[PDB]
Amino acid sequence: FIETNKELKINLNFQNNNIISNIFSNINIYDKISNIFINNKKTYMLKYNNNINEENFFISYFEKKDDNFVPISPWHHIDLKNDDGTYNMIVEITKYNYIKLEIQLREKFNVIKQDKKKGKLRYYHNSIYWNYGALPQTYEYPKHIYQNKEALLFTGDNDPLDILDIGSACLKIGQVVPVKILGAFTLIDEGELDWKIIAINKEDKHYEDINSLSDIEKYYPHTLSLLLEWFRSYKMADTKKLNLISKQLYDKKESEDLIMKTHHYYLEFREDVKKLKEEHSKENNLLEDINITYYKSDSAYKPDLNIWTP
Amino acid sequence: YFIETNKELKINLNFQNNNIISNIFSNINIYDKISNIFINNKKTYMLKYNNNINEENFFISYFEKKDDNFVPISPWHHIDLKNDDGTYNMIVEITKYNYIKLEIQLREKFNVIKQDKKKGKLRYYHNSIYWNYGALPQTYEYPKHIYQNALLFTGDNDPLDILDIGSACLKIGQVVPVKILGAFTLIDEGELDWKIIAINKEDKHYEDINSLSDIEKYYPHTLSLLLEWFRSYKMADTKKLNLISKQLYDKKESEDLIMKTHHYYLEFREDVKKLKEEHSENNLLEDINITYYKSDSAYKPDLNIWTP
C-alpha cells in the first residue's frame, strides 16, 4: 500500500487492476534462451541471460566461428550495412513496450541491459508505438562540435545512433532487422544533439511503396506527427517540461549521410582509443528553428576509456 | 512472482526494484481529508472520498447545503454547468500526469465518481495524461439526435468531456471553474465524442489565452499533443489509431456545443419523466464535416441512467 500523508490511501494491489497487463501483455521475445539467426549470410546467436526485471539481465550476441560460437559485440561486430544496401538495426524496445533496454557501452561485449534511474530499473512512462533500437558501428562522438550575439555549441549524445521502425509488425527484443532509411529528426537538449533515425522494416507490407517521410502518410497516417509529439512529451511526468525538437527534419539522403558520418566518427573513436592506450600504457521555441552545422574537432578531447572496445 | 509468456525467458515481477509505481503514483494530487468542504458559485458543497483507491468500491460522493443539513447530490445533475461569472464548471476526474481512469457513473446512485473497469479489472491508462481531465455537469450527448454529412452519427451517451490546459495540477474530484477555448471531435466507432479544450480560471496566463491559437504563445505544442495523445492512448490494446475530425471548433462554436448538449440534457430529463407516468482509408472520415440530421422520435431514453 502507498502511504499518502493525506486521509485517502492507495491500496496498491496489482491483481485487481490492468497495470501489469498494460505493460507486459505486449512483450515480444525470442522463443528460447539461446536463439540462432542468420544475418548477412552469416550465423550468429542471441542469448537471454537471466530473467526480465532482474538487475543483472543482459542479452549476449555470438558469432559462429567454425564449430563454436564466439562472443561478439552488437556495436562493433554486427555489420552496419548489408550487402543488399540495407542497414541493420538492433531492436532494443519492441512496439508497444515500456521496458527501457539499451546497449551498454561500458559493459563487456556491449551487452543489452535495462537502464537504471535513481538506482531503480527504468520503465517508460508511456507505451512506445514503434520498434526502437540502435545502429551498429555508429557513434555520436562528442569530439566533434556543431554550431549555429555569439554562437551556440552542440555535441553528440555520446551513444550510438538511435533508429525507429515505422513498420506495422512488432519486432523482437534484441533482434537484428534489416531496415531502409526514410528520414530523421533531432532532439536538442542539454546542449547536445540526439539524432533519431526513421526507418522501415525490410519485410513490411509497404516496403517498396514507402521511400521518404511523405510516403508514410499514405500508408501509415500520422506516424510522423505522432513520432515527434511522443518524443516531445514522453518524460513530461517527471521533468515537467517538454523536450526540444528542432523544426528541421532530414530527408532520406541527409539521413544516410548522417549514418556514415557517425560511422566515420566511430572509426575515429576506435583510432583515438588505441593511440591513447599506447600513450599512457606503453522561450526556447525558436531555439528549435536554428540551423546547426559542423564547426571544429576539439583536439583537447580525450576518448572515454570506459567504453569497451576489442 | 513470474509472468507467463509461454516461452523460456521469464519476468521476475518485483515492484521494489523498478520505477513503475513511481511512474504512476508519484504525481497523485488529492484533497487532504476524507470529507472536504468547498464553495462553488456562491453555494457550499462537500466532497467525500469513500474508501481507498484501487479497492472495488471507492467512490467520490458530492453533497450540497440545503440549510440545516447536507443533502446528497449528483455532480452531473446538481452542480451548475455555467457560473454567474460566465465561466463553466469542470469536474476533474483525472489529475494531471496521472493514469487512474475515474469516471462519473451515470448508472450509479447520485452519479458517484468511481474507477472505470476494463475486462473486469480496475482500469488504468496506458500513458500519463498531460492535462486535467473531467466532465461538464448538466450536459449529455443524447443519442436521440442523429448527425449526418450518407453516413450517420449519434452521441457519446455520456456527459461532455473537457480538458484543462492549465499548468497547475488540479485535485481528484475537484470542481474547477474554467474558460472555454475550443473543441475537437473523435469519430469512433460511429458516434461523436467531443472533447472541449478549456483553461483553468487560476492559471497564470488566464487572461492572455482566449482562443486555441493563443496557447502556442504560452504553452507551445499543447494543441498538437492534445490531438496525438487522444489519437493513440488505446493503441496498445486496439492496435489502431483513433479517428479525429480535421475540424476544430473555435471558442464560440464550443460554447454553442456546451449549450446545445445542455439542451440535450434538459430534454433527456423531461423525456424520461414523461415516460414513467405512462406506466399505469479513414483519412476521409477525419476530413468529413458533420451536420445535424433528425431527431429520432422513436428513441426512448435509457432507464438505467440514475435520475432524481
Numbering used by the authors:
A (entry chain A): 37 to 184, 190 to 323, 353 to 380
B (entry chain B): 36 to 184, 192 to 322, 353 to 380
Study text:
The enzyme inorganic pyrophosphatase (PPase) catalyzes the hydrolysis of pyrophosphate (PPi) to inorganic phosphate (Pi). This is an exergonic reaction and can be coupled to several unfavorable and energy demanding biochemical transformations such as DNA replication, protein synthesis and lipid metabolism. Family I PPases are Mg2+ dependent enzymes known to exist as homo-hexamers in prokaryotes and dimers in eukaryotes. We report structural and biochemical characterization of these two apicomplexan PPases.
